[PDB]
């Protein structure tokens, strides 16, 4: 509970921003069939030209203002095309002799906007929103989007608009003001209202996870991160339990404990539970890799391109799970019991660190020969998986930034999912589509199992010859789930937005959609 | 028991060591091939060669005492099989007593004098026929010529390769392992080879013991637990033992040995086992073995590709060889000799407490050393371990160490290198190599490289800055720590670990023991 | 033997200096028991101090009172005998002429090694390179046998000689004082032959790959044979093709210089008790081929010395051809070529057929020596010899086994090996015996050809190459000297011509 | 798992049938890839070879 320090200046807690500017945005959705009022603020049109690639602009909605209608005449818009991500600003006076700002953002020529397309449009919007101190934004949808796509619009808008200034001191943006009102004009508007607050919850679950990820390892360590989960569980009134080193030894979690031997922060196992009222029909364990900093251990990350300076993000899976716990805690789904787990620790170089070649014993009695100390995530996860299965659960889904090999197989946009149960994999994929966080099913190639046959222990931690690391690790993990449906999502590639230099909070929406629609 | 420190309560506190192996229960009988081979239960295997033509045909020469088995092994019926080194075939038949038997053969090539490498391959084929077959007896018929020393090598190698080390298996035990209980051997002039049976058994375990120590990983086998291991061994063998801790080591001013350990969580421990024969003592011998329980490299971390940091639990193979020797000597009991078994055990680690590159440290002989590379920690510990060795007043100092990775580029994985300051001692080592059948090869201490150890500030450099022949330069460095005693140094870095079979060789135990029982 | 060119500025021959300033120095060796005379030039005493880095004490009897009073014990106490250290002063002599006297410390050991001798000499040469004199006199106040005295002379000549062929004052008389001086007169002229033999090799090695290519090097061998009346035959590509030397030819396909094989042969007038074939690696430049030397430390800029075994052999031919030993027939062989990168190069994975029918799977084009020597070995054994001794800068591994001082000798014959070892003792060119460990042979078992050119696993490459070369000697005493580590002098930035004196001593003995 | 070997089919040879008795095959397990094969004589004194994988 008390965070150890080396000097009195070391921080003893993760700074968490709970009430964000986004939360103070009154959102209104109106039906487009009645015309849009253009009284104040900035009014942005989302405009497509089906067919003509890079075609012209032509507004379809009726504007209840004679002045603005004149400005939006097709002859005046002829000079603007619909190129995806393009945008324009307009300034005029309305019938009430009041100044107003109007504009559009290009939505291309395809009618079905991809997840990556919607992001390009949202980023263009946020650009107009940034460096602008206007009080209202109005978005007019002149494109067709389903209910899940519209919610994705809001989630992404909220997340990209928010600026994390927790660690700014002398360099806080002084006059960056957030709009206080959001208006949306859309067809069948009544149907989309249901999604507005759901978007708001999903945003913060994602922004929460991003906060924990972005926080550097001195702030976000095993003790301070486990403290943040308890505070979250108390604000949500979830059952919570934090296992310490003493209880971990008694559960014989040798693999997870070994990884932390060299850290100055004691291991901490996070266990939060949400239980619906009434009859429980689905019991689920979600598990997240929680390495608050991955130095690689004696197998130090000193090879060119090993990106040691980024490894504060090796708890992204843990963050996604806690983020999911916020969503589930807020939306209170029915007829489920959800366990949020994560074996938290820090992988460091010390006289107390475990060594390459060591043989440790997992909590299921299996001996493991350590071949590389930077393969620590699957050691912590093996004990987490044995712990989860002991709860007597229907599904175990773990999510982890496990193997850099995902950069070479799927890249930065699609996560990879591995499993031992088709049904469960199917649901994870379905959840990928309604959450709009892309995942691709990759195989667990059993032929590679033999390279994990250790000469002395029960199993090797790493294959010596096979390079398909992401598949090998999934083979290892599967030896620690004996008789339950289990899937594994490798977010090592998609976790960090290198272009934006910030996390994505990837997984929160996907995991929550998996729990809600089961 | 001397307590091993732990980080968590699950950290092992002892090296698991099996002393009663299944090989200790096999009854060995040696028969003279003259007077007939009987074909009892289990498997019967002939070792056959064909001088001259390679892949030549196999002909069974010895006399079998069974008409059916004789008819089955008729030369006309055996021509369909060749003798290519390693080949093997299984036969099945009924004997004079209407009972089913199993016989076979293993090819030994066309060369007359087989080498240890060839014997290794013949034995490997035998073991293959022992595995995945529930046999109660194996019988081997020697239709090939081997001297007494090579015949012992066959038994030991058979025993070593037959043994399967399952100490660290929990849920993955081979529930099908069944060792034979009886082993027959048919050979000409059998009465002369009989005396080698008991020595081979002793030599097997001595080597298998060092093997257990080496394969024990650094969390099981650390400086405290390994010194505890030696204490127990001395205790079972009524050997004298003294274990020097940090306090005495400071009193003894072992600054080089202590520096290497400054960064470990296990305090340094100096092993000193003593065997003194009861008769008039004519030779006094000190054997020194490098005892690094894990060599991360220190601040000169093993991060370069191919550095095999995951293998460095083996940087104590020399200490294991020397302790394995102590078992043999303690068991066989040579009559007119005094033997000291020494090992400066520690662990090379990265910490705020570690010694740094550039550090200047003082050896127990008062010579100051400038540390140029912390990964060359072995020559630092051996330097102090050698000073201590000369202070005992022995006739020969022989150290054995996995010292330089260059060894893989000079002699490879088969032959170890021997360096020294004394031709006669180097000849005894070369002699013991022939009789132990553990290959060693003499390499020079080239004095011209001495100048590159001339530190600008300390008394001596730990490492050469220009010379790339590491294995020689380290020898030059060690030679500065033995002033007036015959001393040889055996680098086993290349030969200690069996990469193909993924296990240690136990190399050096038999070499060193033979040396101890040398004229 | 016309050297092809890219541009008209490309050189068409190796500048080879045959008459060096060394060859114009008259030397006579005097006995120390008759008093030292200091008439001219600079006089240097070689002194050691047994036991104690100690003080210099002059023992010889100098014939000039003026010089005598200067070398008094009290005056020399201020100088020490640390190996190499030295001092010299200028003065007026007995007859009022300017003489110069000094010492060179020979340490404290009585048995001065070759390495110690080299150090003493360099101290001498350093003094000569900073003073215009016409006579040097060396007083031997230390014990050296006949072979070491010669070696002193040779290495003095070599280090004193400076190669200026590529740039856009010597003494004329040398005097030597030693005990039992008559026992040493024999060696003076031998030293000259041994000096130039090695300095000749040094000239060929230092010659860069644009001056020294297969055409210009084989030409230089012919010119050598003609100046020494040796029997020579050079095989061109058409001959090599008819002889089916696929491994030697493979290595050359990428060069703009055609392969040329050198045969230079020597026969003596007496009874022929031993015929010996000398083989030398002659790669005039080793780019590595498609296995380009691009790794750090590859030292591609040095690869003009990959013909050092050839230079050694040709240096041995000069010595033999000059001294004309009796009772021996010696063939001097070298399959010279160049390992380059081109559309016409051989590739890794290429399967080639050696001149003895054996197919070879190429694994790494930078191990070209194995291949050129394989066909050259098949050749040598076809001449019906007693001994085949090849010498090559074959494997970089040597730098990690023996280093830059001692070379490695491998072979299939203990009697031949021992003769090599003995020859190292009398030439004072250090050489150590390494094993041909047969247990590694199996790593050379190609999956598709008869034999692999390289192991993909065994790191003891020098033994693996040996294992590979031995498969091309079917029944002849054969040794193989790997000089990859000893052949170039890095501190001095010049070649050593290593192996000439060693190989010459082999033929005489 | 790794169970013993048991042959089900009936063979047309009294000698081979004897060799394939369940009591004989127990000595061998069915670990994937493991194999053994023995040379023997059939009911007509001709050389055959029976085994398993
Ligand atoms: Zn890692
Ligand atoms: Zn990690
Ligand atoms: Zn080391
Ligand atoms: Zn070491
Ligand atoms: Zn090359
Ligand atoms: Zn080469």
Author numbering:
A (entry chain C): 86 to 603
B (entry chain A): 85 to 603
C (entry chain F): 86 to 137, 139 to 254, 262 to 602
D (entry chain D): 138 to 190
Can you quote the paper on this entry?
Although overall sequence conservation is low, M17 aminopeptidases possess a conserved homohexameric structure wherein a dimer of trimers encloses an inner cavity harboring the six active sites. The sequence and structure of the proteolytic sites themselves, as well as the reaction they catalyze, are highly conserved, all utilizing two divalent metal ion cofactors to catalyze the removal of select N-terminal amino acids from short peptide chains. PfA-M17 is essential for the blood stage of the parasite life cycle, and inhibition of PfA-M17 results in parasite death both in vitro and in vivo.
An energy scan of the soaked crystals definitively showed that only zinc was present in the crystals. Merging data from multiple datasets collected at the zinc edge successfully illuminated the anomalous signal. To our surprise, when we solved this crystal structure using molecular replacement, the position of the zinc at site 3 was absent and zinc atoms were evident in sites 1 and 2 as seen in the “active form. Comparison of the electron density clearly shows a distinct change in the density for the zinc atoms; however, this time, the anomalous maps could confirm the presence of two zinc atoms. This novel structure, named PfA-M17Zn2+soak, reveals in situ evidence for the dynamic nature of L13 and the contribution of the metal ions to loop movement. The inactive conformation was metal dependent, as when we soaked the crystals in zinc, we changed the affinity of the metal sites and the protein returned to an active conformation, with both the metals and L13 in a conformation ready for hydrolysis.
